[model samples]
Target chain A: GRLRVVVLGSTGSIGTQALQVIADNPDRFEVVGLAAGGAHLDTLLRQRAQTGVTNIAVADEHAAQRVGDIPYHGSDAATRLVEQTEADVVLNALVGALGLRPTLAALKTGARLALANKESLVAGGSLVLRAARPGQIVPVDSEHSALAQCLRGGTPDEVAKLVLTASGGPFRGWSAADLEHVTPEQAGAHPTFSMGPMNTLNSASLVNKGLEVIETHLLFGIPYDRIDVVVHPQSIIHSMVTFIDGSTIAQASPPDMKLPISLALGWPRRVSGAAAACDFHTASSWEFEPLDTDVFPAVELARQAGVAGGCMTAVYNAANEEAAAAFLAGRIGFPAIVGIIADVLHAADQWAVEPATVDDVLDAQRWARERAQRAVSG
Target chain B: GRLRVVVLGSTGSIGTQALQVIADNPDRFEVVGLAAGGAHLDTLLRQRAQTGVTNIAVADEHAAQRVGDIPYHGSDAATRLVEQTEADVVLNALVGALGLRPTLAALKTGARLALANKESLVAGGSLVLRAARPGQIVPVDSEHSALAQCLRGGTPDEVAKLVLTASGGPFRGWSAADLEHVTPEQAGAHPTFSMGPMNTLNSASLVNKGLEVIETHLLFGIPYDRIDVVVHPQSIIHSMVTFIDGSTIAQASPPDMKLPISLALGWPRRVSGAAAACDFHTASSWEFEPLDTDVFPAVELARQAGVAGGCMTAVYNAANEEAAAAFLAGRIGFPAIVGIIADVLHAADQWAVEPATVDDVLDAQRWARERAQRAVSG
Candidate 1:
């Protein structure tokens, strides 16, 4: 018998790839429920029919109307679906802050969360971690997942540092003036990975890597100082963990999200999949360069926000999200995204309150979003 | 207050570096016994006097004359020292087939053997393994030690393959004709690691790597086919373990013997040492190329010897040692070393007997040495 799985955000990039992984390893995993943003209702329904998944949820009301017999819908549909399902694992691939509730709900129910949702951990680190039992949250992001795998080489106490590899995005060596006029199309055309618009934009600006820095710190409890980012143009080497003895254990494979997705689903065990393996037989060149903090300031800014603690991380995340969205919608220039995040972070001293509850997290996020939106308008 | 240790081959390259590592981390290790080949009796005495180690051994008889109260000497001195010492770990750094006896003796006493001696395991695999308790042998060779460290990432069942890196030596791209006229000095000048003449020659000819392949097989019980050798010129990445999930866990450090030695002595713990750490901040280029089996035939020959089993491996080791020595002494040319090994192996089809004891191992070694010597002379 296969382990029951609930895949949240079934229409998105990570979600679609996750389902493909499950499809590749049919004997290992069985999908019980699926939830999406309702824009791709047809695709979601087709997936349900193909996998024989009965329970389904859509976040849009108009699309929910067409589902006569489907059991779940609305903005809280993913959370409701997760709460009701009897799944052994919940693959939460929902984009943006909307993933936070379902992430908490899945963890609260003692289900293993295969998390690709960076926002949940970045914005709600304390609350999410508090809800999670030890080893319950298996990261689905490539970098975090790579670190998680490499970390298995030693105990938490043995780790000296966590090294995250960045592709350096499309505008890797571009100057500040050169980056100012880069269009959304240029920023979104990631050289290695095919990701969502916001993530692609974040990748170009190195903001996603910055958020991953905060995510790594929150997930592993390693200090910000111990976390490092290196530019590896080829996304083959996912990440590395250096032990106290200065011996680094790295995870490498061809750039594929399905591999990490499958790894998260098959935690403590490995299943055969269709992901392309790294061909060592062929001549390959891998170059490691230090991060250019001057050319890319997002990592440093994110580190500052993370170190400040409390709602500062949420503010940084919220501002980035708003700014990235603005850039995608042509409201802001390429460089202005990070500029807005930095401005909002600098000005939101009063809103950087210690979050005592989920409501506090949401309130802080909302305030940061408003402040960041104003910065974009001005 | 510290783990008791016995350092065999105390005056050689690995031994001196190991002693330095011990000196650096005084709080973690205490040298209770020391042994050497007696060529460096003065150095051994200085080390003993410095560390206050009274139990010492010299394998050469003439050199034993200088030792008044050191307690051990002659051919079996290292074995005697191992059997009598009250050490928690025995670091057998003895080069060549002579290390075999002491290695078995250390393991028989249930002491953790920090084995730097490839010949001991390669030539006496069955007997040494039979004598060892589970996890009793911690490899001290950089490649094997790196693999040992990486194996901690997953269970034995999860390992896909063990990848060993080679520096490709000084004659990496040389043609067969180009290698013909190469002098001992040319072959001995290693591109990366500095070492004894015999080891430097073996590195040049890849006989050392070939022996390491057999060592990895014997130590890990992984199939010969599952162990791979790749040419990485920088020698920064020691080795790697690719798991069944397509994820690779690698152990990388600057090419230093002290790091692996320290790691072996501090097995189950990591101690701070003076070995230069891998500075990722500095710009470094690491290129990986598939081993040109046509140019470097040592790997294939070693695999053949290992697979044929028993005394075949001893013959390969004995032949290589004899050939390497002959080359160093100017009796043979650079290319003739592998040629001598191949000819001896081809002629010794009758000597492929299952070694029932250490005497059997030594008998095979003597026979192969005589055969190899005759081939060199012819």
Candidate 2:
């Protein structure tokens, strides 16, 4: 059956590419609806004009009014859009915790959630897992998509361990001394991938990788002990899954978000020529090295939060969100991002209750944010 | 259900290792019967002692006499052993054209054929494929195992192409001028895998890769044009399959035959602790370069034979075997090995009729063998 799709954060990188892929493979996929925070009203309007997919969801009031005549789902837009749309796949590319509701919403609708937003899983953790059925969600992120691709090679019981490859960010070889005076621009300059400033910065401090580690645990149901992070600066090999037979199946290609996005859309039935392949006709070298734990402890902290469970992952994400922004604003040093997250995680030990609802997660997140700001002020 | 295994060529590297795996995983697998041509009567006896199965099939009558009390099939032993035994899997590790009959027999008995022997497929190309049901054959060779492993990440129709990584043998950078004077000992020293002289010499000249290219086509039903060979000197990444979604899944491990062997034995189920994995804690560089088809035309010749179909593949393999042996005996130069095979393939064009049975394949092989010897003498 052809894909009937819904796109959240339709103005974003993942969203635009997905729409582009749909446009290219018009016979294979179609957009049912699209939702955006309405920050980029122009892009969303353009997408709607091109798709003729009348349904539009707007979180902003003025933008909702501006999106006149379209079947607008205002207020709780992303969640409403998913609930109302007859979509087979919902690309919840909405960044941060805001994506969690739509992720759960999509899963409940029996629409395969093409999850690009890491925080949906990192913050929702088991919430998303509990809501999702087997194969209900498809990963749009490079590492998770790679793992998903590799996992097709064997049964779940056959898996021994999973290795997530980190480009090690822009500060790969940078020392603590050098890191102390880093700027936001320097951090945002991802060595391999051209991504949003927030994720690019998260990549800089390895916090994004940490979130991925947490997300991988929740997505795949692998224990934290078996999940490993390897520093692969080239970013050609996204991630690998080692089966019990000692054969490790890895997904490799030039780092391209569109490829993963395309996969998530046309999943179960691959859409041909969605992206170009790695030319074996050329000479190339791929290097793999152990991630420097001491230099970048964000991944380690993520593991700790993941193992701790409950509201801890939520707290970790909130604290990092606050801390990462503080660093961007020059309120703290580059090294302090993870340090503040760790501090918040420690102080919020009493609040580490497994969240019963989205409200509980939000409450935990609010506490961590306030605590993070207090740390920044001090 | 536990695997009732019949091990053909039980004294060879792959066979002995498979026995060791069976010994380790006794609860998971058991020996149903064993067969060998009987070159290593001592090793055969040792195996029989370890595994209390008295059923044996000896190709040599003297070795059959040495096997006293054990029920033995003296002539056409491997086929007889599989035909007579109750096996869930038959590890046809017998080398060369001799393994083809057992391969067909194993498939006929509804036993999954764990094919360590490449020649069975090279000689019996479509014969084995036509006889076997879907998922009836499991590959035990490194490259094919790698391809098979990668294929698991996507459906058969999703695969865009397959890339077979070659170690470039020991003669990687050697010019045609330097290759002409290569000695038997020099050719036998493989770049990565320490294999038999016949396969090692074939690797040096790339006739083994040619055989594998044809074998891969038959095994996977992938077109000749869609299959590729790239020179990966590191041999860490065995092979890669590029899917229609533009994601390339690759299988990587430190060079080990046990992993592929174990995987094939277990089939759909993975057997743990088969071999050591690639340690990511260690730094490693995997380099890939375009295959120097100008210098090594054996792969191209195989492609041609595969495209021609019929008994051409049998002729290609038989001609290469005879010429490769001649090169080992110093009857021909390293360069003349492929030259003789090409000469035989060209001369035996009229004999390219589609083989209807195993006998037709053997007849085609005999014709090529004779033609290859004449070319070697000239």
Q: Best DockQ goes to which candidate?
A: 2
lDDT of 1 by residue, A1-378 (tens): 798999998888888888888887888998899998888777877897788877888888878778545678788999999999999999998889878899999999898998899888888878888899999999899999889878877777888889999999998878898988899778869999998777888899999999999999988899999999988889888998887777787888889898889888988776654466666787777788887787789999999888888888898999988998898899989889998989999997875566788888898889899998898887
Tens digit per residue, CA lDDT, model 2, B1-378: 778999988888778888998999988999988888878888988988999978888898887887666566566877777888988899988888878888999999998999989998889977888899998899998899999878877777888999999999999977888988899988878978877556778888998889999989988889999999999998899899998878899999989888888889987677889888888888888999987777899999999999998999999999988988888788888899888888888887776778888899989988899888888877
Residue lDDT tens for model 2, A1-378: 778989888888778888888899888888888888877878887887899877888888787777676555555877888888888889888888878888888999998889899997889877778898888888999999889888888888988899999998878888888888888878879989877667889999999999999989988989999999889999999999998878899998888888888888877677788877888999999998888898889999999998889889999999999998899888998999999998999888866678888998989999999999999999
DockQ of structure 1: 0.64
Give one clash count per candidate, in the order shown: 0, 1
- In candidate 2, stretches whose alpha carbon ends up further than 4 angstroms from where it belongs are A60-75, A83-86, B62-75
Docking class for model 2 is medium
Question: Which residue pairs collide in model 1, if any?
Answer: none
> Residue A170 of model 1: what lDDT?
96
TM-score on alpha carbons, each prediction: 0.98, 0.95
Residue B209 local lDDT, model 1 = 93
DockQ of each model vs. true complex: 0.64, 0.77
Pairs with steric clashes in candidate 2: A152-B152
